[PDB]
């Protein structure tokens, strides 16, 4: 049950037609994201401004709590309507309103430590109570990636602050707010994070699903992406020696991503292993859709992105391929997709929704993978660069995109096919990637509910929406799908 979900009023999703359905969920998504949030403009106004709840299920299941991953990643598309609408100052004060709950958070002893332990051990938390007290139940707990997207959201917004409204905050002199200035969020929300990050990105904790303990790519890569993003916010607070920290530890993390301690880049499986410590205990072969989920949130598409592993890395687009390959045998639902379909998190997952017995695709795995296609397509136009193919990548491409054999006969004697930009296969190639991720927003319309929001997950056999009601995180990833398809069907 979801008491307090506000259904977006005398709507229903029209089944027959892609764009115009895109078109008004870019604005029902939004709405249902929104209202998730608690800010006292929006219809959340009974809750602690800041507070994100990854959906408004209290039972069957019970998912009324903020994670500081489900908050982080709701904030980035917060950001990027921020940033594409003008600064919009309802949105900006929302965005502080979550940067002083954040401090409080931060703040708030829960049992993976406290603020005080070495290097903030507390930040770990994945979860905390809505009313802001600690989760003291059992949980896969620490969760280290949450500090790593927190840490960068909010410098993103002190970027924006300082790109877009002049360096000026919005929530100054509110009574509710621990800070003054955009130096206070920096040494005291977003550097706490990086000093845990730093910390503890070489130890042990939980998983982005809350289900492993170990090695995880996505950890280490959101990590690695925070570390990178802040080297500037810090050298621009005059924290010249911690920014070169930050630089160093990020550049530690790269090489730990690509090399054999880390274990992620896997050349017997020629695919990243998201959890090498399950391929050794072999109960998971090491496809994830986290693996391309993390690309997609460190790589932004506003951003020069100077860090590794994006969807262009012939491992991470190697396990993208292979997942959906078997999941487009293992759910039923899938059995008429031709291109894109209902994507999950792994394919030995059994979580339902609301207990074990066999999993699920995910909505959010299903828009994320519409996003990798329209990445390649995007990054490539955009900036003028070439598509470069490896043979590991091959397989992908001949069955999905592209017949390589009509671009160069002789492509499999070759290490790589290198598409020029300008070129007429270049066009078809970014065309028929932005008709790929569209198959996939097709398997969304095809099983969204008529009310437009989006649950975490939808049934294998059926295709019919289930578990948690309206995942907050969810209806970022299909807003963030819509914005990214804009963008790259917009260039001439």
Known sequence: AYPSFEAYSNYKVDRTDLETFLDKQKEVSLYYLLQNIAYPEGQFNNGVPGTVIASPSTSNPDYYYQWTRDSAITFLTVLSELEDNNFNTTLAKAVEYYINTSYNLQRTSNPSGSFDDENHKGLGEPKFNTDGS???????????????????????????VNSLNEGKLVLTDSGDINFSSTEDIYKNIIKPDLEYVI???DSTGFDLWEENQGRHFFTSLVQQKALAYAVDIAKSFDDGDFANTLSSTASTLESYLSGSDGGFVNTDVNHIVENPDLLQQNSRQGLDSATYIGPLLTHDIGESSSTPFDVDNEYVLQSYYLLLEDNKDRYSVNSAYSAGAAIGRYPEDVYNGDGSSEGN??????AYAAQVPYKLAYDAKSASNDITINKINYDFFNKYIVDLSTINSAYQSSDSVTIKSGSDEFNTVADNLVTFGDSFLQVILDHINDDGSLN???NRYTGYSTGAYSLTWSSGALLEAIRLRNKVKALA
């Open 199 to 201: 910390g503890y990105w």
């Open 456 to 458: 975490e997950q939808l």
């Open 361 to 366: 695709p995910w909505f959010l795995a299903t």
């Open 134 to 160: 600690a989760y003291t139940g059992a949980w896969g707990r620490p969760q280290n990636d949450g500090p790593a997207l927190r840490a960068y959201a909010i410098s993103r917004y002190l970027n924006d």
